[PDB]
Design a protein around this ligand. Structure first.
Ligand code: MRI
Ligand code: MRI
Lengths: 348, 344
């Protein structure tokens, strides 16, 4: 069965064209609508088709049309379709990716093993590249969690997906505080900040890292203040200064506790660079957190810059040094750390 | 610091009156708005105040106004107020309960222990009674999960809360497919059913029981079809008939044999717990026990023993004060549910 629609390509000229697809199968339902898998007839490539029910322009579409990066799911095409009367659906044709960081972590947890640190480095590094890319546009993802990090098992390529929560943060324009997935929600958000920055994604990324080291979510909070209590149980109670920086409008009730040492949080053999990276991502003070490009340059990722590095299956490392000007724009001189001599494109 | 508002009683004649409270503290911010704890002035009772942004009559209010049961958070009063500029907020004054099943289960998990069996019996029994009461009005909760089961640790009383997803189900009137919390979501929902019934709450209850026996969620699915794959890894692949029963309208899932229930749980798991769980977690919605049937299941036999006592030595909470409303799905079951020693 072949379906043909008029669609606009995600990138390039804003010109509609005929696109045809087959082997249409539902791969999930959601609050937004339905997601299908299908095969493009022209190339034969697998794609996902996210069908979203639409007063306002679709923010997810506006954000997605601007993005093209190796560590983000690419919007191939979009097109409109109809459902009841006056119901309009936006259809996003996206790269298909079979696995997630959530499923890989769950596999290891069930086998009572932690993910080898090399995979933790590979996944986190790619996530940081994706964050550096989107943050350059002022776009904050606001839903960083293992479920939204797609993986191709063979190549170990990670791609960030689900821009349904994403927003361009503009200084002085307030934003909703109840926004990320709860275990990954930055403390400023729990304190009711509406003037928060993209650094909320970095906290989320820190939670993912810690999770991949621990074998389970580091802050598995219940509803209410209990999420904040879980955080305090590791970082300790925030000072009044830290509270001010998180939310200058903080409306005054949590327990007073001293920080548990980071080294004691993780398993005894956890590499010290991993703990050091976590401690620089999971800071109460939003401005104290590493930027994504600074995270990529951290010594925890030194192994990925070693010329002799191979994946456990013997297959080639995925692309790690094809940096874009978007990613490098916050600190171009850091490219001498990030891209070692063996990976440097040569003058020829 | 005393606040005074004009509020209508949740139940009773709809006559506004003045209510005063002190010691207001925020205990939570959610998608709906804010939840506070406060102390009623004249009586000194701790209450919760759940402030919901409103617009169209509030479903949750309409539902809570019909309910009065020992295992359900009671709506004492409701009033209106004003965060959002032009926006009206509904305020529900509710029973306050300090703990949740989520927090108690996490406590035992971090200790590498499981909840003692008597508490599994007490909490699951109280859940089933709460479900029997609401189902008798045709009301489906649609968000049964450990977070929504409040616990008083001293009395072992359980109370169901958060009627935010609840709806009166009416045959022939369609309902949304994507509704419970994912780990507790019934398989007909995953298959996009719109003509489902109250039995989706019983599935959820089965997931809660399985979690209390296991020490973790039984089906921790990823997004999409992976949740069904999790279920299939235990119940085995559903048959054509089972699929038709879940949804007689209209996925790639593997053809796997069912895993035996006794192997799913740890070796000294009480066999009556496993038998109860196998009768809740069934593909076919009609094959699941109804809540009243569940309350009467033999796993709860120990609770009907006149010598039963809590481990702290205290007497068990009210278990047998069944009303006509509560018994109405199968009134004859009262000969089991009200033991001779509890009768007049
Ligand atoms: O409905 C409740 C609720 O949504 C919540 C709730 C509280 C905090 C939060 O962050 C989210 C919640 O759903 O708490 C309750 C506490 C009570 O004692 C009684 C209740 O009915 C609730
Ligand atoms: O954005 C995606 C998505 O929301 C989902 C998704 C799928 C099923 C579901 O139940 C919920 C989802 O968010 O899947 C994707 C798969 C891809 O290969 C690429 C994507 O961008 C998505």
């Amino acid at each position: 069965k072949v379906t043909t629609v008029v669609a606009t390509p995600g990138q390039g000229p804003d010109r509609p064209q005929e696109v045809s697809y087959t082997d249409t199968k539902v791969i999930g339902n959601g609050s937004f609508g339905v997601v299908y898998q299908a095969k493009l007839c022209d190339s034969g490539e697998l794609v996902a088709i996210k069908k979203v029910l639409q007063r306002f322009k679709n923010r997810e579409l506006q954000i997605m049309r601007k993005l093209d990066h190796c560590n983000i799911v690419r919007l191939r095409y979009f097109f409109y379709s109809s459902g009841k009367k006056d119901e309009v659906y936006l259809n996003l044709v996206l790269d298909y990716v079979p696995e997630t960081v959530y499923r890989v972590a769950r596999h290891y947890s069930r086998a009572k093993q932690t993910l080898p640190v090399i995979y933790v480095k590979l996944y986190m590094y790619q996530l940081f590249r994706s964050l550096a890319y989107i943050h350059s546009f002022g776009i904050c993802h606001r839903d960083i969690k293992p479920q939204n990090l797609l993986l191709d098992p063979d190549t170990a390529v990670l791609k960030l997906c689900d821009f349904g929560s994403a927003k361009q943060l503009v200084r002085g324009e307030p934003n909703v505080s109840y926004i990320c997935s709860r275990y990954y929600r930055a403390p400023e958000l729990i304190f009711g900040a509406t003037d928060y920055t993209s650094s909320i994604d970095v906290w989320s990324a820190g939670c993912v890292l810690a999770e991949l080291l621990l074998g389970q979510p580091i802050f598995p909070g219940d509803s209410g203040v209990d999420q904040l209590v879980e955080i305090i149980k590791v970082l300790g109670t925030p000072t009044r200064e830290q509270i001010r920086e998180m939310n200058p409008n903080y409306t005054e009730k949590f327990p007073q506790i001293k920080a548990h040492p980071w080294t004691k949080v993780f398993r005894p053999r956890t590499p010290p660079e991993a703990i050091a990276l976590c401690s620089r991502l999971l800071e109460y003070t939003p401005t104290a957190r590493l930027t994504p490009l600074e995270a990529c340059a951290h010594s925890f990722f030194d192994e990925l810059r070693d010329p002799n590095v191979k994946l456990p299956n013997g297959r080639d490392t995925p692309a790690l040094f094809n940096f874009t000007t978007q990613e490098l724009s916050s600190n171009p001189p850091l490219a001498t750390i990030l891209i070692p001599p063996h990976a440097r494109i040569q003058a020829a």
